[PDB]
Amino acid sequence: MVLYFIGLGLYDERDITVKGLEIAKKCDYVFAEFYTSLMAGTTLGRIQKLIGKEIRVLSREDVELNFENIVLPLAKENDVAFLTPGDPLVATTHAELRIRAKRAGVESYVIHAPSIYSAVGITGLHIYKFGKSATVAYPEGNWFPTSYYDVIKENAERGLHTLLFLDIKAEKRMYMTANEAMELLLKVEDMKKGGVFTDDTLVVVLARAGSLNPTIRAGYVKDLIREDFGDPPHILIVPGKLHIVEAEYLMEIAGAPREILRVN
Amino acid sequence: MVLYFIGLGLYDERDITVKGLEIAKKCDYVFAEFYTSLMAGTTLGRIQKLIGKEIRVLSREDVELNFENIVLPLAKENDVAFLTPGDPLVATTHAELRIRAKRAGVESYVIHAPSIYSAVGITGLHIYKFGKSATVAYPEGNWFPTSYYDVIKENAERGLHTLLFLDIKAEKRMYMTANEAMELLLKVEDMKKGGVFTDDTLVVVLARAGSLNPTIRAGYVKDLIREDFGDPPHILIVPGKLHIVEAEYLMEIAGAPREILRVNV
Ligand SMILES: Nc1ncnc2c1ncn2[C@@H]1O[C@H](CSCC[C@H](N)C(=O)O)[C@@H](O)[C@H]1O
Ligand code: NA
């Protein structure tokens, strides 16, 4: 008679917490969505095998328009689990689903999992120094999103790092690469000319966090724009003012150029 | 012949990931530290029982001063694990530990787990709206730090939420409760009078994140400052202007007063 929102983690089926696994295995029905992010190191089959249940995957429309018609009805008479990549509530609108659950008289519980939001720690950038985050969205038709550019500007003025979630078109199997994000940002700069993102801007790329060998690279846009960072998912980060120890990590672990040491 | 930084997660022994547990079980030596934070929903004994290996606890000095003499040497001929509450490398100084490993010729890998940085999502506050984070520290002697108050001011001014970690003295096991944090912030407000943190400020308190039964409470300082949020540690958040959906979540899930719909949105 309850609903569990359970995160599956960053890259593969084993990124689920022990808590999440033991609970999922005992749920009567298991639902999931894989449109909010990409778990590049696993498959629906491997996940089902792990928890030993058949998983009904839902589309964004199924969730946003019919969560209360598809999932909640079963939660009224059974224990139901709703799985999501990473942490279920981070950079999604799933939190709102708990309100729906309540209205339907269904108690809900959240089981966290490693999220890209904290995995940024592996870039060596102090996590407390990150400011407002944003998402680089694919332009659509004549509509060209640019608010994310202003976020970078605002954080940079404060010396804070900016985390940029990258766009995803799950149904089209399209996952935005850090390269595509950089290209878009350069075009926005050419339009706004705020000196926010140029060929000389230091950026950090984190690809496939959660995997054993994620790609962690740092350097100037002019040098990374055409670099191959491997398969998606990717996140792009625009550091603010660096502490010496952050720069040292970027240099020795992420291959950044020695010049970034002159933080002042 | 490798070092694994493995996160223990949020609250109890089941907050480690399947990957983290399986790797820890394959390591010849397993170390851990609980000075950055504690695992309040479990005990060292339960964690050791789960992993099935003796766990050697290291002090702040053992780590900061002698990581290369205690942990790294063993990675030359063995697989070693270094367990930390939350997600590895989140604590400010831990990333440098990877640099030490590399400089010492030791390959290292990071196995992630849930962190409070992402788990605060359960407050219903949009993660992208969080700005710079800070820690509320106790004043000592002739030193009265107030930077955390300025962080709140700068974030709120830009419509951003502020995640506030509360002072902790692991060894002594002395915690600053959310109540104590509010009292301190009010004192700072009286000093700077910037209109940043007052009796009318809306705040959110999160305790025992990770547990199946966390305490999530939202309301004005005047009403929550003397409320009992249960056992520490507590996390304090000062939201910036709210999206109506965030407000509705705080009301339905965190018991916030309906007044926030007309005052903080
Ligand atoms: N393992 C990973 N490596 C790199 N980027 C990742 C990632 N997982 C998610 N992302 C980034 O975040 C975007 C999804 S946003 C949803 C995030 C998810 N709830 C979480 O907690 O992680 C992706 O398009 C990508 O830009
Ligand atoms: Na943050």
XYZ file of C-alpha atoms and ligand atoms in Angstrom:
556
model
C 0.000 0.000 0.000
C 2.973 2.307 -0.586
C 5.014 3.820 -3.406
C 8.812 3.891 -3.465
C 10.778 6.322 -5.635
C 14.079 4.496 -6.076
C 17.180 5.865 -7.747
C 19.308 3.493 -9.825
C 22.423 5.626 -9.894
C 24.939 7.003 -12.371
C 26.097 4.382 -14.851
C 25.035 0.762 -14.347
C 22.600 -1.367 -12.361
C 25.045 -1.763 -9.465
C 24.951 1.980 -8.702
C 21.671 1.326 -6.883
C 22.021 1.429 -3.091
C 21.751 -1.817 -1.150
C 18.673 -0.277 0.462
C 17.111 0.394 -2.927
C 17.856 -3.103 -4.178
C 16.435 -4.963 -1.183
C 13.231 -2.908 -1.352
C 12.776 -3.165 -5.124
C 13.174 -6.959 -4.995
C 10.156 -7.191 -2.692
C 7.818 -4.810 -4.495
C 4.712 -6.266 -6.116
C 4.939 -4.053 -9.208
C 7.910 -2.137 -10.599
C 7.699 0.841 -12.957
C 10.502 2.997 -14.339
C 11.404 5.837 -16.687
C 14.642 6.294 -18.612
C 13.990 9.644 -20.249
C 15.464 11.912 -17.553
C 19.015 10.619 -17.964
C 21.183 7.922 -19.527
C 22.706 4.959 -17.707
C 25.310 4.113 -20.336
C 26.614 0.988 -18.624
C 23.497 -1.155 -18.325
C 20.297 -2.336 -20.016
C 16.674 -2.906 -19.058
C 17.458 -6.612 -19.075
C 20.360 -6.319 -16.637
C 18.314 -4.178 -14.260
C 15.388 -6.611 -14.312
C 17.747 -9.508 -13.682
C 19.278 -7.730 -10.685
C 16.002 -6.981 -8.886
C 14.308 -10.116 -10.221
C 11.200 -8.294 -11.486
C 9.595 -7.343 -14.782
C 9.847 -3.583 -15.225
C 7.200 -1.547 -17.017
C 8.966 1.431 -18.579
C 6.950 4.648 -18.854
C 7.367 7.533 -21.297
C 7.403 11.179 -20.221
C 3.780 11.430 -21.328
C 2.819 8.361 -19.294
C 4.392 9.946 -16.222
C 3.486 13.615 -16.553
C -0.065 13.144 -17.822
C -0.983 9.738 -16.391
C 1.110 8.852 -13.338
C -2.045 8.862 -11.195
C -3.792 6.558 -13.688
C -0.973 4.097 -14.327
C 1.062 3.808 -11.130
C -0.951 5.135 -8.189
C -3.928 2.788 -8.648
C -1.699 -0.227 -7.953
C 0.005 1.495 -5.026
C -3.361 1.582 -3.269
C -3.438 -2.204 -2.868
C 0.211 -3.202 -3.357
C 3.811 -2.112 -2.788
C 4.976 -0.335 -5.916
C 8.372 0.921 -6.994
C 9.131 3.644 -9.526
C 12.757 3.537 -10.696
C 14.774 6.354 -12.267
C 18.380 6.914 -13.361
C 20.533 8.767 -10.812
C 18.584 10.260 -7.903
C 14.835 10.413 -8.687
C 14.339 14.014 -7.525
C 17.464 15.730 -8.894
C 16.979 17.872 -12.004
C 13.589 16.259 -12.657
C 10.055 17.223 -11.878
C 9.406 13.944 -10.074
C 9.128 15.621 -6.671
C 5.709 16.857 -7.754
C 4.702 13.201 -8.131
C 4.793 12.831 -4.337
C 2.001 15.401 -4.135
C -0.080 13.303 -6.515
C 0.641 10.206 -4.420
C -0.571 11.965 -1.284
C -3.765 13.251 -2.906
C -4.478 9.651 -3.879
C -4.005 8.581 -0.261
C -0.763 6.756 -1.104
C 2.205 7.059 1.252
C 5.467 7.436 -0.656
C 9.113 6.897 0.239
C 12.303 8.083 -1.445
C 15.457 5.964 -1.755
C 18.378 8.042 -2.983
C 21.171 6.936 -5.304
C 24.410 8.548 -6.515
C 23.578 11.669 -8.546
C 25.578 13.568 -11.139
C 25.005 16.621 -8.942
C 27.426 15.315 -6.294
C 29.549 13.239 -8.645
C 31.020 16.550 -9.823
C 33.275 16.074 -6.816
C 35.467 13.815 -8.961
C 36.443 16.872 -11.056
C 38.392 18.196 -8.075
C 36.265 21.372 -7.987
C 35.023 22.173 -4.463
C 31.332 21.293 -4.497
C 30.415 24.126 -2.124
C 31.724 26.590 -4.726
C 29.123 25.691 -7.346
C 26.437 28.293 -7.891
C 23.155 28.197 -9.794
C 23.001 25.305 -12.247
C 21.497 25.275 -15.723
C 20.680 23.116 -18.727
C 21.987 23.595 -22.266
C 18.962 22.850 -24.427
C 18.948 21.923 -28.102
C 17.555 24.814 -30.146
C 14.150 24.028 -31.676
C 13.097 25.555 -34.966
C 13.546 29.313 -34.761
C 13.610 29.084 -30.941
C 17.173 29.348 -29.604
C 17.426 28.989 -25.767
C 20.131 31.093 -24.108
C 19.248 31.587 -20.425
C 21.988 29.110 -19.483
C 24.519 31.645 -20.770
C 23.264 34.214 -18.251
C 23.593 31.676 -15.436
C 27.292 31.205 -16.222
C 27.710 34.978 -16.305
C 26.019 35.406 -12.909
C 28.044 32.651 -11.213
C 31.343 33.693 -12.786
C 30.886 37.261 -11.543
C 30.656 35.725 -8.064
C 33.624 33.426 -8.638
C 31.387 30.342 -8.500
C 31.461 27.229 -10.691
C 28.567 26.479 -13.037
C 27.211 22.966 -13.565
C 25.551 22.559 -16.956
C 23.244 19.567 -17.355
C 23.100 18.669 -21.061
C 19.952 18.075 -23.106
C 18.438 14.695 -23.904
C 15.836 13.497 -26.425
C 15.382 9.954 -25.103
C 12.872 8.865 -27.731
C 15.228 10.050 -30.488
C 18.157 8.377 -28.721
C 19.907 11.759 -28.817
C 22.208 12.797 -25.975
C 23.930 16.178 -26.129
C 27.721 16.002 -26.006
C 29.968 18.525 -24.283
C 31.211 19.405 -27.771
C 27.726 20.340 -28.952
C 27.184 22.363 -25.775
C 30.420 24.288 -26.316
C 29.474 25.034 -29.926
C 26.070 26.347 -28.827
C 27.650 28.496 -26.122
C 30.135 29.982 -28.601
C 27.206 30.930 -30.832
C 25.404 32.547 -27.894
C 28.560 34.502 -27.069
C 28.799 35.736 -30.652
C 25.245 37.019 -30.196
C 25.440 38.522 -26.692
C 29.157 39.381 -26.660
C 29.263 39.381 -22.873
C 32.710 37.811 -22.834
C 31.224 34.912 -20.872
C 32.174 31.932 -23.047
C 35.042 32.192 -25.560
C 37.814 30.050 -27.044
C 39.942 31.000 -24.034
C 37.375 29.982 -21.424
C 38.498 27.186 -19.102
C 35.965 24.348 -19.012
C 35.714 20.902 -17.461
C 34.067 17.872 -19.020
C 32.879 14.819 -17.098
C 31.667 11.892 -19.172
C 30.063 8.685 -17.910
C 30.460 9.380 -14.206
C 29.845 6.197 -12.235
C 31.842 4.095 -14.669
C 35.242 2.878 -13.479
C 37.032 4.987 -16.071
C 34.989 8.146 -16.625
C 36.458 10.782 -18.916
C 37.580 13.793 -16.874
C 39.123 16.573 -18.940
C 39.863 20.237 -18.356
C 41.247 22.900 -20.646
C 40.448 25.841 -22.887
C 37.465 25.670 -25.238
C 39.706 26.137 -28.279
C 41.493 22.885 -27.413
C 38.558 20.788 -26.174
C 35.836 21.849 -28.630
C 36.696 19.013 -31.042
C 38.090 16.500 -28.566
C 36.475 13.077 -28.307
C 35.218 12.602 -24.745
C 33.677 9.205 -25.445
C 30.069 8.021 -25.307
C 27.387 10.050 -23.462
C 26.134 11.118 -21.015
C 28.284 14.236 -20.561
C 28.051 17.306 -18.331
C 29.915 20.546 -18.950
C 31.264 22.730 -16.161
C 32.513 26.302 -16.379
C 34.697 26.899 -13.296
C 34.676 30.241 -11.516
C 37.800 31.429 -9.691
C 39.972 28.418 -8.834
C 41.701 27.606 -5.550
C 45.256 26.362 -6.092
C 44.320 22.835 -4.996
C 41.448 22.755 -7.516
C 43.844 23.778 -10.279
C 46.372 21.164 -9.161
C 43.741 18.426 -9.417
C 42.586 19.625 -12.847
C 46.197 19.575 -14.016
C 47.315 16.244 -12.594
C 44.077 14.289 -12.965
C 42.191 16.059 -15.776
C 45.164 17.073 -17.916
C 44.602 20.834 -17.697
C 47.417 23.184 -18.811
C 49.815 24.550 -16.165
C 48.751 28.105 -17.003
C 45.533 27.719 -15.016
C 47.648 27.888 -11.836
C 47.755 31.685 -12.034
C 44.341 31.864 -10.343
C 44.735 35.587 -9.617
C 47.277 -2.909 -6.533
C 44.660 -0.150 -6.602
C 42.966 2.271 -4.190
C 39.166 2.568 -4.144
C 37.452 5.664 -2.736
C 34.050 4.242 -1.756
C 31.081 6.221 -0.517
C 28.970 4.897 2.344
C 25.983 7.029 1.505
C 23.613 8.971 3.726
C 22.433 7.303 6.906
C 22.807 3.582 7.559
C 24.784 0.538 6.462
C 22.459 -0.090 3.501
C 23.227 3.272 1.904
C 26.398 1.999 0.267
C 25.808 0.972 -3.368
C 25.821 -2.615 -4.622
C 28.988 -1.743 -6.535
C 30.565 -0.214 -3.429
C 29.803 -3.252 -1.295
C 30.997 -5.783 -3.883
C 34.278 -3.932 -4.385
C 34.871 -3.419 -0.660
C 34.424 -7.166 -0.159
C 37.173 -7.826 -2.705
C 39.688 -5.447 -1.110
C 42.425 -6.847 1.129
C 42.412 -3.794 3.385
C 39.502 -1.533 4.219
C 39.862 1.884 5.854
C 37.231 4.432 6.847
C 36.916 7.888 8.387
C 34.025 9.416 10.314
C 35.414 12.843 11.164
C 33.855 14.592 8.152
C 30.444 13.232 9.095
C 28.938 10.289 10.935
C 26.567 7.543 9.817
C 23.889 8.258 12.445
C 21.582 5.424 11.425
C 24.101 2.649 11.991
C 27.280 1.676 13.833
C 30.816 0.732 12.898
C 29.946 -2.804 13.956
C 26.981 -3.047 11.606
C 28.957 -1.648 8.688
C 31.794 -4.099 9.373
C 29.292 -6.947 9.656
C 27.771 -6.016 6.291
C 31.067 -5.691 4.443
C 32.462 -8.792 6.115
C 35.914 -7.313 6.718
C 37.576 -5.562 9.628
C 37.485 -1.820 9.064
C 40.334 0.324 10.317
C 39.110 3.753 11.351
C 41.403 6.675 10.602
C 41.482 10.037 12.378
C 41.618 13.422 10.674
C 45.352 13.487 11.338
C 45.815 9.938 10.037
C 44.263 11.054 6.762
C 45.357 14.667 6.271
C 48.868 14.113 7.589
C 49.617 10.458 6.870
C 47.436 9.135 4.057
C 50.607 8.241 2.125
C 52.097 6.320 5.067
C 49.031 4.431 6.260
C 46.858 3.788 3.212
C 48.932 4.185 0.049
C 51.777 1.752 0.899
C 49.316 -1.136 1.037
C 48.057 -0.445 -2.501
C 51.366 -1.573 -3.995
C 50.584 -5.265 -3.466
C 46.919 -5.177 -2.429
C 43.573 -3.649 -3.323
C 42.666 -1.059 -0.714
C 39.382 0.654 0.079
C 38.916 4.015 1.803
C 35.317 4.459 2.975
C 33.761 7.864 3.626
C 30.213 8.913 4.557
C 28.257 10.250 1.582
C 29.829 10.502 -1.892
C 33.653 10.367 -2.146
C 35.547 13.583 -2.851
C 32.617 15.741 -1.729
C 34.419 16.791 1.472
C 36.580 19.748 0.409
C 39.994 18.195 1.131
C 39.382 14.686 -0.192
C 40.036 15.409 -3.869
C 43.628 16.224 -2.875
C 43.919 12.670 -1.529
C 43.588 11.430 -5.122
C 46.425 13.748 -6.111
C 48.557 12.183 -3.369
C 47.703 8.736 -4.660
C 48.681 9.650 -8.208
C 51.902 11.354 -7.123
C 52.752 8.250 -5.096
C 52.189 6.021 -8.130
C 48.912 4.483 -6.960
C 45.986 4.085 -9.374
C 42.691 5.094 -7.773
C 39.006 4.760 -8.615
C 35.911 6.420 -7.187
C 32.747 4.471 -6.337
C 29.890 6.908 -5.770
C 27.047 6.869 -3.234
C 24.284 9.349 -2.274
C 25.345 12.731 -0.898
C 23.344 15.285 1.078
C 24.091 17.660 -1.814
C 21.641 15.716 -3.972
C 19.500 14.152 -1.263
C 18.244 17.615 -0.240
C 16.133 17.229 -3.371
C 13.663 15.521 -1.073
C 12.808 18.963 0.335
C 11.044 19.640 -2.953
C 13.383 22.578 -3.662
C 14.665 22.487 -7.260
C 18.322 21.465 -7.310
C 19.251 23.980 -10.009
C 18.127 26.830 -7.743
C 20.751 26.121 -5.086
C 23.568 28.655 -5.042
C 26.848 28.669 -3.109
C 26.846 26.422 -0.033
C 28.295 27.143 3.395
C 28.771 25.931 6.946
C 27.415 27.628 10.067
C 30.337 27.709 12.501
C 30.387 28.537 16.208
C 32.176 31.747 17.220
C 35.321 31.075 19.280
C 37.305 33.410 21.503
C 37.813 36.713 19.707
C 36.773 35.187 16.396
C 33.208 35.633 15.179
C 32.978 34.410 11.562
C 29.874 35.393 9.607
C 30.648 34.478 5.996
C 27.782 31.963 5.915
C 25.375 34.827 6.563
C 26.771 36.685 3.552
C 26.392 33.556 1.417
C 22.694 33.447 2.265
C 22.399 37.142 1.393
C 24.090 36.793 -2.000
C 22.134 33.667 -2.955
C 18.716 34.930 -1.803
C 19.312 38.221 -3.609
C 19.539 36.193 -6.814
C 16.537 34.018 -5.993
C 18.709 31.056 -5.021
C 18.473 28.575 -2.132
C 21.303 28.186 0.376
C 22.326 24.776 1.724
C 23.808 25.203 5.204
C 25.901 22.512 6.855
C 25.980 22.774 10.639
C 29.098 22.728 12.831
C 30.159 19.223 13.829
C 32.811 17.898 16.199
C 32.901 14.203 15.290
C 35.518 13.142 17.817
C 33.597 14.862 20.617
C 30.362 13.844 18.862
C 29.049 17.371 19.513
C 26.493 18.609 16.979
C 25.024 22.012 16.250
C 21.266 21.525 15.992
C 19.151 23.422 13.485
C 17.731 25.287 16.480
C 21.186 26.412 17.578
C 21.935 27.419 13.990
C 18.854 29.638 13.829
C 19.751 31.283 17.147
C 23.247 32.027 15.849
C 21.975 33.404 12.547
C 19.567 35.696 14.398
C 22.487 36.997 16.455
C 24.428 37.674 13.262
C 21.369 39.412 11.816
C 21.316 41.668 14.875
C 24.975 42.479 14.185
C 24.863 43.124 10.438
C 21.179 44.053 10.190
C 21.056 43.198 6.501
C 17.526 41.828 6.708
C 18.818 38.416 5.652
C 17.747 36.157 8.510
C 14.913 37.202 10.829
C 11.962 35.747 12.722
C 9.978 36.025 9.478
C 12.489 34.114 7.350
C 11.217 30.883 5.793
C 13.552 27.956 6.438
C 13.625 24.219 5.849
C 15.110 21.631 8.189
C 16.103 18.185 6.969
C 17.173 15.483 9.391
C 18.093 11.863 8.830
C 18.055 12.078 5.038
C 18.478 8.549 3.689
C 16.269 7.048 6.348
C 12.887 5.731 5.296
C 11.508 8.222 7.826
C 13.397 11.517 7.473
C 12.223 14.681 9.210
C 11.387 17.387 6.662
C 9.996 20.577 8.162
C 9.374 23.979 6.637
C 8.178 27.162 8.283
C 9.135 30.538 9.687
C 11.997 30.909 12.156
C 9.666 32.316 14.809
C 7.742 29.038 14.725
C 10.533 26.505 14.167
C 13.347 27.878 16.329
C 12.146 25.906 19.366
C 10.741 22.897 17.535
C 12.148 19.434 18.180
C 13.577 18.055 14.941
C 14.868 14.914 16.606
C 18.450 13.715 16.920
C 21.259 15.517 15.059
C 22.786 15.975 12.591
C 20.472 18.510 10.981
C 20.811 20.346 7.680
C 19.413 23.873 7.383
C 18.251 25.450 4.137
C 17.228 29.065 3.566
C 15.224 29.032 0.319
C 15.181 31.962 -2.074
C 11.883 33.027 -3.672
C 9.824 29.893 -4.341
C 8.374 28.444 -7.521
C 4.735 27.672 -6.645
C 5.438 23.956 -7.145
C 8.198 24.093 -4.518
C 5.803 25.855 -2.138
C 3.096 23.249 -2.677
C 5.570 20.457 -1.968
C 6.709 22.111 1.271
C 3.076 22.373 2.364
C 2.051 18.820 1.454
C 5.270 17.070 2.461
C 7.055 19.328 4.959
C 4.046 20.746 6.810
C 4.685 24.346 5.767
C 2.049 26.992 6.631
C -0.283 28.058 3.797
C 1.001 31.585 4.361
C 4.089 30.785 2.272
C 1.905 30.726 -0.852
C 1.242 34.452 -0.538
C 4.489 35.509 1.136
C 7.306 33.473 -0.405
C 6.154 32.853 -3.981
N 26.741 9.396 -15.282
C 26.667 10.632 -15.806
N 27.766 11.223 -16.383
C 27.751 12.471 -16.932
N 26.636 13.270 -16.964
C 25.533 12.695 -16.390
C 25.472 11.441 -15.818
N 24.164 11.195 -15.331
C 23.503 12.273 -15.611
N 24.227 13.261 -16.259
C 23.938 14.508 -16.716
O 22.606 14.967 -16.217
C 21.622 14.994 -17.288
C 20.302 14.335 -16.730
S 19.561 15.387 -15.545
C 18.847 14.114 -14.421
C 19.875 13.805 -13.343
C 19.600 12.656 -12.419
N 18.300 12.736 -11.629
C 20.773 12.489 -11.358
O 20.479 12.476 -10.151
O 21.976 12.367 -11.824
C 22.241 14.284 -18.440
O 21.686 14.738 -19.669
C 23.738 14.618 -18.235
O 24.068 15.905 -18.761
Na 25.400 23.276 -4.956
